[PDB]
Scaffold this active site. Structure first.
Site, PDB file in Angstrom:
ATOM      1  CD  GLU A  83      15.017 -41.909  17.657  1.00 19.86           C
ATOM      2  OE1 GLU A  83      13.896 -41.447  17.822  1.00 19.86           O
ATOM      3  OE2 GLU A  83      14.438 -43.378  17.528  1.00 19.86           O
TER       4      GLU A  83
ATOM      5  CD1 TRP B 218      10.897 -40.820  19.489  1.00 17.54           C
ATOM      6  CD2 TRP B 218       9.612 -42.869  20.380  1.00 17.54           C
ATOM      7  NE1 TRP B 218      11.840 -41.642  18.611  1.00 17.54           N
ATOM      8  CE2 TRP B 218      11.486 -42.740  19.550  1.00 17.54           C
ATOM      9  CE3 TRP B 218       9.686 -43.738  20.947  1.00 17.54           C
ATOM     10  CZ2 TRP B 218      11.724 -44.267  19.227  1.00 17.54           C
ATOM     11  CZ3 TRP B 218       9.813 -45.185  20.864  1.00 17.54           C
ATOM     12  CH2 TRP B 218      10.820 -44.859  19.673  1.00 17.54           C
TER      13      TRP B 218
ATOM     14  CG  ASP C  72      21.531 -38.917  21.172  1.00 18.90           C
ATOM     15  OD1 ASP C  72      20.094 -38.732  22.101  1.00 18.90           O
ATOM     16  OD2 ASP C  72      22.296 -39.633  21.456  1.00 18.90           O
TER      17      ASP C  72
END
EC number: 3.2.1.3
Length: 492
Positions: free
Chosen positions: A210, A139, A207
């Site tokens: 993402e 992620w 940010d």
């Protein structure tokens, strides 16, 4: 699919009248917001209390996770409801369960780190599973806005307990909670997030969208606010040396935000550059709805906020105008709008709500875009403050709000126009700001689902809803627009 979702029964939006729509939606959108928060008294009574799901969408796309950012922003809306009503104890219980779950998530080791790492490095982790376990897949981590917005939300609940509930917590005689006093919440849950922000404000992360790593205006702004707001909390618990650490750090971040190290204020283009490192890469030119969403989250109308970059800042308002003008040409859906219009994230976006192709306008961005002119009018009229229009923003005001040569015929020779409180032109400008804000809420009324729920996105050609269903943050953004609209309409 969004199996958990429950429509508001036998409701269908009335698309013929904005006033009636906003009155009804005030209740409907709060139902959809609270549906996505687990608390024993709620609809979502089978989850872990204090869990906020971003959406009930569990595939195409899968947003059935808890993010630190969306949970915090959700609870700023819950808090506004708690403040406006009688410190409703049902809502306050929901906030205390979120404070308890937040304590547990802080102490959950994950791919960003753990609680025992330097300055609690694990607190930058963006999302967790709904059972409170770590999300172990790849992620965009870390995201350093989350601990700042959580620290601000929980700080604000402590201020409201002190001012509205005589300093008492609502879940005091419960065995399920990991605090028994306001001091416990401060020392154990608020402080660790402020230590994170002190440790990592000058560090690189992802940010709010993402997607990219580097310097980001929103992230730095929401950090500056968390630190500034906590100064008086820290003083109240006799944590004086830390209060002055927070004060000093907040001032340092203020200077970073407005100077050449940050790179956000760009006087060559005269707007904010949201992600300056992507301007250097030539990948994005800097326009982003985050530039005006951060100002709105960090200047609630019920506070007297010192913090920089309110929505009357010239470079924030120029980013807002130039994104509006971009999106009016970019999205075919916006051909029938002559004032406000559906707004997206950033002009370079390719995310289509469940893959990549062409980006779309977003319901949350459109609801925040209504709040910009509502707040400009509310701040002037509520306080009887003059409206001062800087030369960089003359094009915006002349196109959409008022013809400035009807106020001062020689305005183009001055650096600013000041419209005095009480004057007929001041009342015209404030009413025209409100009517402009309403035009964005008319876009939402044209395109909202019939069941009153708001998706993440609306398609750029048709305006039909798309992406994640009943996004918590969308519901919240619309609720705050209705709140601000009712506050400014109560003054006239």
């Amino acid at each position: 699919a969004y199996p958990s979702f429950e429509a508001y029964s036998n409701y269908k939006v009335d698309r013929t009248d904005l006033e009636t729509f906003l009155d009804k939606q005030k209740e409907v959108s709060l139902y959809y917001l609270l549906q996505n928060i687990a608390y024993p008294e709620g609809q979502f009574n089978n989850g872990v209390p204090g869990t906020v799901i971003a959406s009930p969408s569990t595939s195409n796309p899968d947003y059935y996770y808890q993010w630190t950012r969306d949970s915090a922003i959700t609870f700023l809306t819950v808090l506004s409801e708690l403040e406006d009503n009688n410190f409703n104890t049902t809502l306050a219980k929901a906030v205390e369960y979120y404070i308890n779950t937040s304590y547990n998530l802080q102490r959950t080791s994950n791919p960003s780190g753990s609680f025992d790492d330097e300055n609690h490095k694990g607190l930058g982790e963006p999302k967790f599973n709904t059972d409170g376990s770590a999300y172990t897949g790849a992620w965009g981590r870390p995201q350093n806005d989350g601990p700042a917005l959580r620290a601000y939300a929980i700080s604000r609940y402590l201020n409201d307990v002190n001012s509205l509930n005589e300093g008492k917590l609502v879940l005091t005689d419960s065995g399920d909670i990991n605090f028994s006093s306001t001091e416990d919440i401060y020392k154990n849950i608020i402080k660790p997030d402020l230590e994170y922000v002190i440790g990592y404000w000058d560090s690189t992360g992802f940010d709010l969208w993402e997607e990219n790593q580097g310097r980001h205006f929103f992230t730095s702004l929401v950090q500056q606010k968390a630190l500034a707001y906590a100064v008086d909390i820290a003083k109240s618990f006799d944590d004086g040396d830390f209060a002055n650490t927070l004060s000093s750090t907040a001032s340092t971040l203020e200077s970073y935000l407005s100077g050449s190290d940050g790179g956000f204020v760009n006087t060559d283009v005269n707007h904010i550059v949201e992600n300056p490192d992507l301007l250097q890469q030539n990948s994005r030119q800097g326009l982003d709805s985050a530039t005006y969403i951060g100002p709105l989250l960090t200047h609630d109308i019920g506070e007297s906020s010192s913090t920089p970059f309110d929505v009357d800042n010239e470079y924030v308002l120029q980013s807002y105008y130039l994104l509006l003008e971009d999106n009016k040409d970019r999205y075919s859906v916006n051909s029938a709008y002559s004032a406000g219009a559906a707004i997206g994230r950033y002009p370079e976006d390719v995310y289509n709500g469940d893959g990549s192709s062409e980006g779309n306008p977003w319901f949350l961005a459109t609801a925040y875009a209504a709040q910009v002119p509502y707040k400009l009018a509310y701040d002037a009229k509520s306080a009887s403050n003059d409206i001062t229009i800087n030369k960089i923003n003359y094009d915006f005001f002349n196109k959409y709000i008022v013809d400035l040569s009807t106020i001062n015929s020689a305005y183009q020779s001055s650096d600013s126009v000041t419209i005095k409180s009480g004057s007929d032109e001041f009342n015209t400008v404030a009413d025209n700001l409100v009517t402009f804000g309403d035009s964005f809420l008319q876009v939402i009324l044209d395109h909202i689902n019939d069941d009153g729920s708001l998706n993440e996105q609306l398609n750029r050609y048709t305006g039909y809803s798309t992406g994640a269903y009943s996004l918590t943050w969308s519901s919240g953004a619309l609720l705050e627009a209705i709140r601000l609209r009712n506050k400014v309409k109560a003054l006239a």
